[PDB]
Design a protein around this ligand. Structure first.
Ligand code: SF4
Ligand SMILES: [Zn+2]
Ligand SMILES: [Zn+2]
Ligand SMILES: [Zn+2]
Lengths: 380, 677
DNA sequence: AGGTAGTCACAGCTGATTGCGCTG
DNA sequence: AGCGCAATCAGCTGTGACTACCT
């Protein structure tokens, strides 16, 4: 039988009257039921992650001049890559991005593997005006990525993302041997095609554990990149995976004190123009080297300079707040004022924390579970 | 699961049944209940065999008396092995779903070379000598002399099979050819002889077309096996061609030289009955008279015997006795081997054919050769003209002969090409979650000039440039494999020469590798191997071949192999050599078949047969193009199989190269997304 | 002084004519 | 220069509003 060939639904039978006017009570119940439309979690997916050393390979062949994506594939690809780099560094604190451009059967390492987003964005903007010629070489790009990532620590997840526009690749040697070597090296390879499905990309993605997708339009391209942003699930505990990193305090210099010492920034020292000789900035806790941008690994002593708030922003996932016990107002024989907003409790349901047994209204409960991520009573 | 047909339940290994399979089962059950022949057309090479075998087994279980013997004649040995393994899988499914065995036997039949255990004959590559060596090793005289136990090397598998293998039967257990060989070698028996003994006590059996189309072996292999039996010819789109070739023989200088060389040896052996000893001597000069005659053609199917009875003045009666003399005089002469002896047998076969079959045949002498026409080469061939003769002895001996293939679009021409009484007129078009093929016809090029491969325009530079441009900018959109079929080798080489002359073949090379299929078997095989290895990785490849070649049907382009199939012009058979025109005249004055209609039917049959090999499996998908404006006309589109007609929308019937490329890009982009089951 | 059937523009369909193409 | 597919004209009709004549 069919669902719609039976009896027609009467959704208006829910409302009923006993005292001629209880519709106000019904609409109050409906308004209360309208709230709490979430699961008390902003993400609700992967609550953790792992250090990812991701390499992004961009096709630089003549096929990038095609106008499937306005204005051409290269410009849309680089714009979406800038967006992807920004989002990936936003959602991954201690990750690194490398960019490889393959052209004329050779692969050029456009950018070193590091955690600076500004350098990658500047490199992409510079590469916007590149010359699209020749044919891509997946073998050379994968060889460069494997050579770079072979010496990386085992606990980090090694990933390669390939943007393959051209349907043909030139390999100076057998590629399936390289795929076997990558599989033995536990390097994940993901490919996002632009024209159509290529067998070698499917085999590579299946064997290395990655995913192979083909772009339908620019929105689908952005969706695939956004999916690639998310970190992979992390095993319980592998080994002593740790890392020596510093937390450079942003100590600026004021001439009101006698210790106002101007210093050139190491990052700005490599620029053609005059480096910024500002009063202060981020001083390395180990060698007192000065940097302006974070997170940037120290050039001198090799220490990783990260920002503590960036690491702390993900701490609420480790310790989620347990849902408060929903209690009807009549059954709660205690105070009738919310502990968070001091407002009078007039809702039919009152939420009580399991730890401190305090009183929270619906709005304060939603705010605590969604945004605050901490019980105000438990803090005291 | 158990599929509930209108009057029976049939077990099927696969739980899900496509609507095409269900309708096919309905039609086949209707035909079996109708006790008549039929013709079927399905688009899937795989999944048809399992359904056919399942319905056959269900019908045998329900009606053991109505159906007793099943024949599954196919084209080659890979089809035999795949249908045998599918039958084995079906039997395993039945055993695991029922729990008790059944007394059903299924065996595969092939030549002596396929089924032999002696290591002294396997390494050699002479298919015409293996049978002779097998006969020499074991025969009636060998059996007679084995009583005295003569000390001489001979085959001994039969000498054990006749005393031990003729009593123990094999009621249950279907055996493949390798299984038959293993049983023969473990029991010391010949696989061929045990197959000959066990075909009588068997349920199903599979072999090639030649064991039923050729009268010289059909009687030996099938004489009184079963009065009421079911036979099916899967992949029989070219049944007429093989039927014609069944009664076609050729003669050349080498054949007559071999005959005159071996007649002296025969006479020397004889001088160490008389009705043929002097009969065979003077037959050579009558046919060598045509060697010295410098004439274009002589045709006299009824008057050939009249002319024979004048130069040598021989009666017609002794000619028909050659067939019965072959099995008698040769075994008494104790021929050591059939090497240097086959032309003598083929001369007797030709004499018997011309003496008996003279109503629908024609004799043609062709003094022409490729690249060396007139040096010394009067070629005499007894070309058959009617396809009904090779199919008569099976329609009257069977009840439900079924003709099925992937290309049987016109069901009104096969019943009149060969004497047939169809009662089905049934076709089936596959359905999937998405359209797995994108057929389209490309007419004029970017210059709005037709790319028709017309004879007057074959040498035109504009059409060659348009073909090259189509192959170039098509090779940049379809990845990992393109198969292009040309009308003929001469046109193919002349087009690639022009492409090389211009700076256009380099642009095709830098996209995909170019591989050219030639007449050499080893070169073709190695080219196919390197094409496959280039398609495996991302390099891509192009397979340039001919529609009427051994590679068009010898291989199947499964998914990721040949995503696009390109037809450069309508493949029309050569009207020269005065062989096709004789058949055209015979069909014109006998079956009232229009010459243009038959030529278009043959062209479209070949085009569809070579373009439908890119879709093997539900998940497989492929691009199909037709690079000729003549395809756009309705009289040729209507000859395409129904599973391609509905996917060929009227939007793309004359679109140029650019719009064809755009359609291909959209199709390939939309076919790469994940789907469901 | 007021109102309805021709009439024009623009499109559709089906029913025939009638005019160009039709094999290596 | 005989067939056959395809382009083309005739006849009727739908949609919408404009307009001439007279009880
Ligand atoms: S009898 Fe059988 S085993 Fe012996 S030579 Fe002939 S085919 Fe081979
Ligand atoms: Zn430092
Ligand atoms: Zn509150
Ligand atoms: Zn609390």
């Amino acid at each position: 039988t069919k669902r719609w060939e039976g009896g027609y639904e009467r959704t208006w039978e829910i409302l009923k009257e006993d005292e001629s006017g209880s519709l106000k009570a019904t609409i109050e119940d409906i308004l209360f039921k309208a709230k709490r439309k979430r699961v008390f979690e902003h993400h609700g997916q992967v609550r953790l992650g792992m250090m990812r050393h991701l390499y992004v390979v961009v096709d630089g062949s003549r096929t990038m001049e095609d106008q499937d994506l306005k204005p051409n594939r290269l410009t849309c690809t680089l714009k979406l890559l800038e967006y992807f780099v920004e989002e990936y560094f936003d959602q991954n604190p201690i990750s690194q991005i490398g960019i490889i451009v393959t052209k004329s059967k050779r692969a050029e390492k456009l950018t070193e593997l590091s955690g600076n987003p500004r350098k990658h964005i500047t490199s992409l903007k510079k590469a916007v005006d590149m010359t699209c010629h020749g044919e891509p070489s997946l073998y050379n790009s994968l060889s460069i990525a494997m050579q770079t990532l072979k010496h990386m620590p085992g606990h980090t997840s090694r990933e390669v993302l390939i943007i393959f526009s051209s349907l043909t690749t030139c390999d100076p040697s057998n590629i399936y041997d390289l795929i076997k070597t990558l599989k033995a090296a536990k390097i994940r390879v993901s490919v996002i095609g632009l024209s159509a499905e290529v067998r070698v990309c499917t085999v590579l993605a299946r064997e290395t554990g990655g995913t192979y997708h083909v772009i339908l339009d620019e929105s689908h391209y952005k969706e695939l990149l956004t999916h690639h942003v998310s970190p992979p699930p992390a095993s319980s505990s592998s080994e002593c995976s740790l890392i020596r990193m510093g937390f450079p305090q942003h100590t600026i210099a004021s001439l009101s004190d006698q210790d106002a010492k101007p210093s050139f920034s190491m990052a700005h020292l490599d620029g053609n123009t005059e480096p910024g000789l500002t009063l202060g900035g981020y001083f390395c806790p180990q060698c007192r080297a000065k940097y302006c941008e974070l997170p940037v690994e120290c050039k001198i002593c090799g220490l990783t300079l990260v920002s503590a708030p960036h690491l702390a922003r993900s701490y609420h996932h480790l310790f989620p707040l347990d849902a408060f016990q929903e209690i009807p107002l009549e059954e709660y024989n205690g105070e009738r004022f919310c502990y968070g907003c001091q407002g009078e409790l007039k809702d039919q349901h009152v939420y009580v924390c399991a730890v401190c047994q305090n009183v929270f209204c619906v709005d304060c409960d939603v705010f605590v579970h969604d945004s605050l991520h901490c019980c105000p009573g438990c803090i005291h | 699961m158990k599929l509930n047909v209108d009057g029976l339940l049939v077990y099927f290994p696969y739980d899900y049944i496509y609507p095409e399979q269900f309708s096919y089962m309905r039609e086949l059950k209707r035909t079996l209940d109708a006790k008549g022949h039929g013709v079927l057309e399905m688009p899937s090479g795989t999944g048809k065999t399992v359904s056919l075998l399942a319905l056959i087994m269900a019908y045998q279980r329900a009606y053991p008396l109505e159906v007793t013997k099943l024949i599954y004649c196919s084209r080659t040995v890979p089809e035999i092995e795949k249908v045998i393994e599918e039958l084995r899988k079906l039997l395993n499914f039945y055993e695991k779903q029922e729990g008790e065995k059944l007394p059903f036997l299924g065996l595969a039949l092939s030549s002596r070379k396929n089924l032999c255990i002696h290591p002294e004959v396997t390494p050699l590559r002479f298919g015409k000598d293996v049978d002779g060596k097998c006969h020499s090793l074991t025969a009636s005289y060998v059996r007679a002399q084995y009583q005295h136990d003569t000390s001489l090397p001979h085959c001994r598998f039969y000498e054990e099979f006749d005393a031990h293998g003729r009593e123990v039967p094999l009621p249950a257990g279907i055996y493949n050819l390798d299984d038959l060989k293993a049983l023969g070698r473990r029991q010391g028996w010949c696989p061929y002889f045990l197959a000959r003994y066990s075909i009588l006590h068997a349920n199903v059996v599979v072999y090639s077309y030649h064991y039923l189309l050729d009268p010289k072996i059909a009687d030996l292999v099938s004489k009184e096996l079963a009065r009421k039996a079911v036979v099916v010819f899967d992949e029989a789109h070219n049944i007429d061609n093989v039927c014609i070739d069944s009664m076609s023989v050729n003669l050349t200088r080498r054949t007559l030289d071999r005959c005159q060389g071996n007649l002296e040896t025969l006479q020397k052996t004889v001088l160490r009955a008389e009705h043929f000893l002097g009969f065979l001597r003077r037959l050579l000069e009558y046919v060598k008279w045509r060697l010295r005659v410098q004439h274009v053609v002589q045709e006299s199917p009824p008057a050939f015997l009249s002319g024979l009875a004048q130069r040598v003045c021989i009666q017609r009666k002794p000619l028909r006795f050659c067939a019965e003399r072959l099995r008698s005089l040769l075994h008494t002469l104790e021929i050591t081997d059939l090497a240097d002896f086959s032309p003598l047998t083929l001369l007797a076969n030709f004499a018997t054919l011309v003496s008996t079959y003279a109503k629908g045949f024609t004799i043609i002498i062709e003094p022409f050769d490729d690249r060396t026409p007139t040096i010394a080469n009067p070629i005499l061939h007894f070309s058959c003209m009617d396809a009904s003769l090779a199919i008569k002895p099976v329609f009257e001996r069977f009840q439900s002969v079924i003709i099925t293939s992937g290309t049987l679009s016109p069901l009104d021409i096969y019943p009149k090409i060969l004497d047939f009484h169809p009662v089905t007129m049934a076709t089936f078009t596959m359905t999937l979650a998405r359209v797995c093929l994108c057929p389209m016809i490309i007419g004029r090029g970017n210059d709005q000039v037709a790319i028709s491969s017309k004879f007057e325009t074959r040498e035109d530079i504009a059409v060659i440039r348009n073909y090259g441009n189509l192959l170039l900018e098509m090779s940049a959109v379809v990845p990992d494999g393109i198969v292009a079929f040309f009308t003929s080798y001469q046109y193919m080489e002349s087009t690639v020469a022009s492409w090389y002359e211009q700076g256009i073949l380099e642009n095709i090379q830098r996209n995909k590798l170019l591989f050219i299929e030639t007449q050499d078997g080893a070169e073709t095989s190695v080219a196919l191997e390197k094409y496959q290895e280039a398609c495996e990785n991302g390099r891509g490849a192009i397979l340039l071949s001919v529609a009427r070649g051994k590679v068009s049907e010898g291989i199947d382009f499964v998914h990721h192999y040949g995503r696009a199939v390109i037809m450069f012009g309508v493949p029309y058979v050569y009207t020269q050599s005065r062989i096709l025109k004789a058949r055209l005249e015979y069909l014109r004055d006998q079956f009232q078949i229009r010459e243009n209609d038959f030529l278009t039917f043959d062209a479209m049959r070949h085009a569809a047969q070579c373009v439908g090999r890119a879709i093997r499996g539900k998940t497989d998908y492929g691009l199909m193009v037709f690079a000729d404006k003549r395809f756009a006309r309705g009289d040729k589109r209507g000859k395409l199989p129904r599973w391609i007609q509905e996917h060929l929308t009227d939007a793309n019937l004359n679109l140029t190269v650019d719009e064809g490329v755009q359609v291909a890009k959209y199709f390939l982009r939309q076919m790469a997304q994940p789907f469901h089951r």
